[PDB]
Scaffold this active site. Structure first.
Site, PDB file in Angstrom:
ATOM      1  CG  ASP A 161      -1.990   1.058   0.976  1.00  0.00           C
ATOM      2  OD1 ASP A 161      -3.150   1.388   0.652  1.00  0.00           O
ATOM      3  OD2 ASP A 161      -1.898   2.873   1.801  1.00  0.00           O
ATOM      4  CE1 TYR A 190       0.311   7.757   3.344  1.00  0.00           C
ATOM      5  CE2 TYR A 190       0.629   5.570   2.201  1.00  0.00           C
ATOM      6  CZ  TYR A 190      -0.037   6.197   2.863  1.00  0.00           C
ATOM      7  OH  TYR A 190      -1.377   5.874   3.048  1.00  0.00           O
ATOM      8  CE  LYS A 242      -3.327   5.068   0.115  1.00  0.00           C
ATOM      9  NZ  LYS A 242      -2.214   4.688   0.632  1.00  0.00           N
ATOM     10  CG  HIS A 295      -5.334   9.451  -0.110  1.00  0.00           C
ATOM     11  ND1 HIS A 295      -3.220   9.759  -0.095  1.00  0.00           N
ATOM     12  CD2 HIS A 295      -4.885   9.027   1.114  1.00  0.00           C
ATOM     13  CE1 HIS A 295      -3.309   8.917   0.663  1.00  0.00           C
ATOM     14  NE2 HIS A 295      -3.987   8.730   2.028  1.00  0.00           N
TER      15      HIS A 295
HETATM   16  N1  LIG Z   1      -5.761   5.771   3.113  1.00  0.00           N
HETATM   17  C1  LIG Z   1      -5.583   6.591   4.210  1.00  0.00           C
HETATM   18  O1  LIG Z   1      -6.173   7.690   4.426  1.00  0.00           O
HETATM   19  C2  LIG Z   1      -4.070   5.649   5.463  1.00  0.00           C
HETATM   20  C3  LIG Z   1      -4.810   6.714   6.693  1.00  0.00           C
HETATM   21  C4  LIG Z   1      -3.398   5.465   7.371  1.00  0.00           C
HETATM   22  C5  LIG Z   1      -3.177   4.760   6.891  1.00  0.00           C
HETATM   23  N2  LIG Z   1      -3.366   4.313   5.485  1.00  0.00           N
HETATM   24  C6  LIG Z   1      -2.166   2.588   5.041  1.00  0.00           C
HETATM   25  O2  LIG Z   1      -2.247   2.036   6.464  1.00  0.00           O
HETATM   26  C7  LIG Z   1      -0.516   2.127   6.744  1.00  0.00           C
HETATM   27  C8  LIG Z   1      -0.776   1.099   8.263  1.00  0.00           C
HETATM   28  O3  LIG Z   1      -1.537   2.169   8.672  1.00  0.00           O
HETATM   29  P1  LIG Z   1      -0.480   3.290   9.990  1.00  0.00           P
HETATM   30  O4  LIG Z   1       0.663   2.924   9.018  1.00  0.00           O
HETATM   31  O5  LIG Z   1      -1.084   4.451  10.141  1.00  0.00           O
HETATM   32  O6  LIG Z   1      -0.052   2.108  11.466  1.00  0.00           O
HETATM   33  P2  LIG Z   1      -0.507   0.630  11.918  1.00  0.00           P
HETATM   34  O7  LIG Z   1       0.340  -0.028  10.575  1.00  0.00           O
HETATM   35  O8  LIG Z   1      -1.054   0.932  12.704  1.00  0.00           O
HETATM   36  O9  LIG Z   1       1.226   1.055  13.124  1.00  0.00           O
HETATM   37  C9  LIG Z   1       2.558   1.098  11.960  1.00  0.00           C
HETATM   38  C10 LIG Z   1       3.258   1.063  13.728  1.00  0.00           C
HETATM   39  O10 LIG Z   1       3.319  -0.169  14.443  1.00  0.00           O
HETATM   40  C11 LIG Z   1       3.979  -0.977  14.563  1.00  0.00           C
HETATM   41  N3  LIG Z   1       4.291  -1.562  14.326  1.00  0.00           N
HETATM   42  C12 LIG Z   1       4.491  -2.429  13.204  1.00  0.00           C
HETATM   43  N4  LIG Z   1       4.439  -4.100  13.573  1.00  0.00           N
HETATM   44  C13 LIG Z   1       4.507  -4.019  14.325  1.00  0.00           C
HETATM   45  C14 LIG Z   1       4.457  -5.570  15.619  1.00  0.00           C
HETATM   46  N5  LIG Z   1       4.781  -6.666  15.546  1.00  0.00           N
HETATM   47  N6  LIG Z   1       4.846  -5.016  16.971  1.00  0.00           N
HETATM   48  C15 LIG Z   1       4.693  -3.422  17.245  1.00  0.00           C
HETATM   49  N7  LIG Z   1       4.606  -2.225  16.749  1.00  0.00           N
HETATM   50  C16 LIG Z   1       4.754  -2.898  15.232  1.00  0.00           C
HETATM   51  C17 LIG Z   1       5.111   0.116  13.290  1.00  0.00           C
HETATM   52  O11 LIG Z   1       6.549   0.293  13.555  1.00  0.00           O
HETATM   53  P3  LIG Z   1       7.619   0.450  12.990  1.00  0.00           P
HETATM   54  O12 LIG Z   1       7.481   0.464  11.772  1.00  0.00           O
HETATM   55  O13 LIG Z   1       8.923   0.824  13.843  1.00  0.00           O
HETATM   56  O14 LIG Z   1       8.019  -0.984  13.367  1.00  0.00           O
HETATM   57  C18 LIG Z   1       4.846   1.753  13.399  1.00  0.00           C
HETATM   58  O15 LIG Z   1       5.326   2.318  14.377  1.00  0.00           O
HETATM   59  C19 LIG Z   1       0.008   2.915   6.326  1.00  0.00           C
HETATM   60  O16 LIG Z   1       1.224   2.567   6.565  1.00  0.00           O
HETATM   61  C20 LIG Z   1      -0.375   3.305   5.274  1.00  0.00           C
HETATM   62  O17 LIG Z   1      -0.040   2.389   4.411  1.00  0.00           O
HETATM   63  C21 LIG Z   1      -3.471   4.577   4.796  1.00  0.00           C
HETATM   64  O1  LIG Z   2      -4.220  10.432   5.448  1.00  0.00           O
HETATM   65  C1  LIG Z   2      -3.100   9.470   5.100  1.00  0.00           C
HETATM   66  O2  LIG Z   2      -2.789   8.130   4.343  1.00  0.00           O
HETATM   67  C2  LIG Z   2      -2.175   9.206   6.389  1.00  0.00           C
HETATM   68  O3  LIG Z   2      -2.068  10.287   6.781  1.00  0.00           O
HETATM   69  C3  LIG Z   2      -1.136  11.650   6.368  1.00  0.00           C
HETATM   70  C4  LIG Z   2      -0.338  11.097   5.604  1.00  0.00           C
HETATM   71  C5  LIG Z   2       0.368  12.162   5.131  1.00  0.00           C
HETATM   72 CL1  LIG Z   2       1.950  11.680   4.521  1.00  0.00          CL
HETATM   73  C6  LIG Z   2       0.486  13.290   5.069  1.00  0.00           C
HETATM   74  C7  LIG Z   2      -0.486  13.587   6.487  1.00  0.00           C
HETATM   75  C8  LIG Z   2      -1.689  13.231   6.627  1.00  0.00           C
HETATM   76  C9  LIG Z   2      -3.135  13.043   7.268  1.00  0.00           C
HETATM   77  O4  LIG Z   2      -2.774  14.341   8.256  1.00  0.00           O
HETATM   78  N1  LIG Z   2      -4.068  12.489   7.278  1.00  0.00           N
HETATM   79  C10 LIG Z   2      -5.249  12.701   7.922  1.00  0.00           C
HETATM   80  C11 LIG Z   2      -6.538  13.663   6.607  1.00  0.00           C
HETATM   81  C12 LIG Z   2      -7.971  13.709   7.498  1.00  0.00           C
HETATM   82  F1  LIG Z   2      -8.297  13.701   8.567  1.00  0.00           F
HETATM   83  C13 LIG Z   2      -8.151  14.149   6.006  1.00  0.00           C
HETATM   84  F2  LIG Z   2      -9.840  14.213   6.925  1.00  0.00           F
HETATM   85  C14 LIG Z   2      -7.646  15.272   5.045  1.00  0.00           C
HETATM   86 BR1  LIG Z   2      -8.845  15.754   3.611  1.00  0.00          BR
HETATM   87  C15 LIG Z   2      -6.848  14.787   4.385  1.00  0.00           C
HETATM   88  F3  LIG Z   2      -6.306  15.126   3.731  1.00  0.00           F
HETATM   89  C16 LIG Z   2      -5.500  13.943   5.747  1.00  0.00           C
HETATM   90  F4  LIG Z   2      -4.460  14.180   5.458  1.00  0.00           F
END
Ligand SMILES: NC(=O)c1ccc[n+]([C@@H]2O[C@H](COP(=O)([O-])OP(=O)(O)OC[C@H]3O[C@@H](n4cnc5c(N)ncnc54)[C@H](OP(=O)(O)O)[C@@H]3O)[C@@H](O)[C@H]2O)c1
Ligand SMILES: O=C(O)COc1cc(Cl)ccc1C(=O)NCc1c(F)c(F)c(Br)c(F)c1F
EC number: 1.1.1.21
Length: 316
Positions: free
Chosen positions: A44, A49, A78, A111
């Site tokens: 993903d 990012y 995205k 996104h």
């Molecule tokens: N569409 C969107 O708006 C959106 C928003 C948020 C996230 N996302 C996607 O979802 C992905 C995952 O969400 P996230 O990055 O917010 O957080 P997450 O996956 O819930 O948590 C990541 C954190 O957990 C730690 N971690 C991972 N595996 C672990 C384990 N086995 N034990 C203990 N700690 C562990 C990582 O540390 P280390 O890396 O240091 O190991 C990092 O600090 C993102 O990276 C992104 O690709 C999308």
């Molecule tokens: O969005 C993601 O995938 C993870 O979060 C981020 C990643 C980067 Cl590199 C920079 C900012 C964010 C962040 O502030 N996210 C929260 C967030 C919202 F809640 C929202 F409502 C709108 Br609209 C946004 F645009 C938005 F960004």
């Protein structure tokens, strides 16, 4: 439980993927290489990012090494908010393709539902700190996404952070050509999303759960916030199953027919997080985890709350 889920475009999507938000550019190439070596087939990504070039280096090396074939990978990115305009969508997709060193994406998501003023800044603000909207709407942005399918740049299109009314709006779009394949939303035991998940699943849209571990590395974390990984109730379920708390947190959405995308750059954790296909949570475990809901979101943003299309004013 099978490793892939069937999408409404006829393609199969791996239910476990590697997240890359916050993965430092100097670490993410190795993270993705390790992930592919230990079995991950879904990554993903997102332009915002700022690490797609480095993710792409890993993907390309593993393809060149013939560790995997391109058809076996499922690469997601995205469209960022500053590219919602008709004339910008293709170029945004192409920049992502060029950075990832791919000739197609398996899935390309809007996104966030909100369009922002185009320009260099990812979050253009007015002098009082409000995001500056674009007058684009989700329907016209969707039409632009459909064009990408028809040009061969992407195999599937979807949405992210769309609330139920916004998902409905797309499904009810006049002249809709392709339904969204996926809605990627925040989901974990503190934000269980029953209402939105049921709606999406009822329409044949696959839900991907982001921040499944509660994003402990999110940059706006406060020392006081709730912590899934440290919750003794979840630790207890993990102990009963001889698994880690993270493994329980990853298995949980899998059993709800969700895709899940935990992020790590730690090689041992990347491997740990993949070892989730050989145990099962009971129905009682599942209901117990669901009971921890507190409507707590990692992912919200004050600067965007007045945008007409900000998704989190609605209940779901
Ligand atoms: N569409 C969107 O708006 C959106 C928003 C948020 C996230 N996302 C996607 O979802 C992905 C995952 O969400 P996230 O990055 O917010 O957080 P997450 O996956 O819930 O948590 C990541 C954190 O957990 C730690 N971690 C991972 N595996 C672990 C384990 N086995 N034990 C203990 N700690 C562990 C990582 O540390 P280390 O890396 O240091 O190991 C990092 O600090 C993102 O990276 C992104 O690709 C999308
Ligand atoms: O969005 C993601 O995938 C993870 O979060 C981020 C990643 C980067 Cl590199 C920079 C900012 C964010 C962040 O502030 N996210 C929260 C967030 C919202 F809640 C929202 F409502 C709108 Br609209 C946004 F645009 C938005 F960004």
């Amino acid at each position: 439980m099978a490793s892939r889920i069937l999408l409404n475009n006829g393609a199969k999507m791996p239910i476990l993927g590697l997240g890359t938000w916050k993965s430092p550019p100097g670490q993410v190439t190795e993270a993705v290489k390790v992930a592919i070596d230990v079995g991950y087939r879904h990554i993903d990504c997102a332009h915002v990012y700022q690490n797609e070039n480095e993710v792409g280096v890993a993907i390309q090396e593993k393809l060149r090494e013939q560790v995997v074939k391109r058809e076996e990978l499922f690469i997601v990115s995205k469209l960022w908010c500053t590219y919602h305009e008709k004339g910008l969508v293709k170029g945004a997709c192409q920049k992502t393709l060029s950075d990832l060193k791919l000739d197609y994406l398996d899935l390309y998501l809007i996104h966030w539902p909100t369009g922002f003023k185009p320009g260099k800044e990812f979050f253009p603000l007015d002098e009082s700190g409000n995001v500056v909207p674009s007058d684009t709407n989700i329907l016209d942005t969707w039409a632009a996404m459909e064009e990408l399918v028809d040009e061969g740049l992407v195999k599937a299109i979807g949405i992210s952070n769309f609330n139920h009314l916004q998902v409905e709006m797309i499904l009810n779009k006049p002249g809709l050509k392709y339904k969204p394949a996926v809605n990627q939303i925040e989901c974990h035991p503190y934000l269980t999303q029953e209402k939105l998940i049921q709606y999406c699943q009822s329409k044949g849209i696959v839900v991907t759960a982001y921040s499944p571990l509660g994003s402990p590395d999110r940059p706006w974390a406060k020392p006081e916030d709730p912590s899934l990984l440290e919750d003794p109730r979840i630790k207890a379920i993990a102990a009963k199953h001889n698994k880690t708390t993270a493994q329980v947190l990853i298995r949980f959405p899998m059993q709800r027919n969700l895709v899940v995308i935990p992020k790590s750059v730690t090689p041992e954790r990347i491997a740990e997080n993949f070892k989730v296909f050989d145990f099962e949570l009971s129905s009682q475990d599942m209901t117990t985890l669901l009971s921890y809901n507190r409507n707590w979101r990692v992912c919200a943003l004050l600067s965007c709350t007045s945008h007409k299309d900000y998704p989190f004013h609605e209940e779901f």
